[PDB]
Amino acid sequence: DSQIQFTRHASDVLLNLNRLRSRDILTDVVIVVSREQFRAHKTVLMACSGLFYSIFTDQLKRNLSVINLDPEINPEGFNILLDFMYTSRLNLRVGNIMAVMATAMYLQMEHVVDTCRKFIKAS
Amino acid sequence: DSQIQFTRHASDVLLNLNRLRSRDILTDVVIVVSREQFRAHKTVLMACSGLFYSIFTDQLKRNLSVINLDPEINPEGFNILLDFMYTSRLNLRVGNIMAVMATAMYLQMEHVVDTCRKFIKAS
């Protein structure tokens, strides 16, 4: 409310969280997408994705160390979205727009889908 | 670099991380401060504190579920800093500044220490 605001703190936290991912420090889940595998932190996955929230919030699945995604998910599209989660930067190109949008819908990241919609429209 | 920037994503992630802490979801450590206990996420602690980074980055201590802080640490001051880590907001009042500053020194949060110094200077 009337507390002092650190305007860079949130971005600095996310940057260190991504650094921890890049060194595999306290990563607690691998996400299998067809042939690929991505290690990550369940907390960040839950904070950023409705699908991952709905999985790990259920005590039936909260302790899983492996999550197999839908085999139709494109790994490049997932990687772009995983990067976004940890960076706030979304790499939308003409060559990946369709794969990134579809993957964002499957992961229930509405703002990204909403931004994919505006990207479409601005093309 | 040339990707789309989501200016509110990092703050949105931290808010959900704090929500997860408030429901004790995926918390993986308890910090003992005199007669008090605080549950938290090791990744957030490490991202925010040089002390907590140095502890959990060491494989000798990375798997600890309990951390006992120095008995001289004031629990209210620790709580204020724990809140700051998860909110980017620092509750500095001249009734608590000394105990917050000394705690931020122990936790190796230089940004906060530097701010406490200017709070003193701005009187």
Ligand SMILES: CC(C)NC(=O)Cn1cc(CN2CCN(C)CC2)c2ccc(NC(=S)NCCc3c[nH]c4ccccc34)cc21
């Ligand atoms: C970084 C940020 C912008 N990314 C998201 O918000 C992605 N996301 C997208 C959704 C799904 N949306 C939600 C809004 N709704 C109208 C349409 C469907 C979603 C859901 C959960 C989380 N993760 C966490 S920790 N949420 C804590 C609050 C909460 C949400 N639903 C709850 C259910 C029970 C208790 C708490 C909650 C992230 C989610």
Ligand SMILES: CC(C)NC(=O)Cn1cc(CN2CCN(C)CC2)c2ccc(NC(=S)NCCc3c[nH]c4ccccc34)cc21
């Ligand atoms: C959210 C942000 C504003 N809060 C901090 O930065 C609090 N903090 C304060 C310090 C201690 N400072 C650091 C600067 N130095 C000149 C004086 C002492 C500190 C240390 C680690 C972390 N956590 C993480 S993940 N760091 C990843 C990068 C890294 C730092 N040291 C490394 C050593 C080896 C490998 C990597 C690194 C947080 C730290």
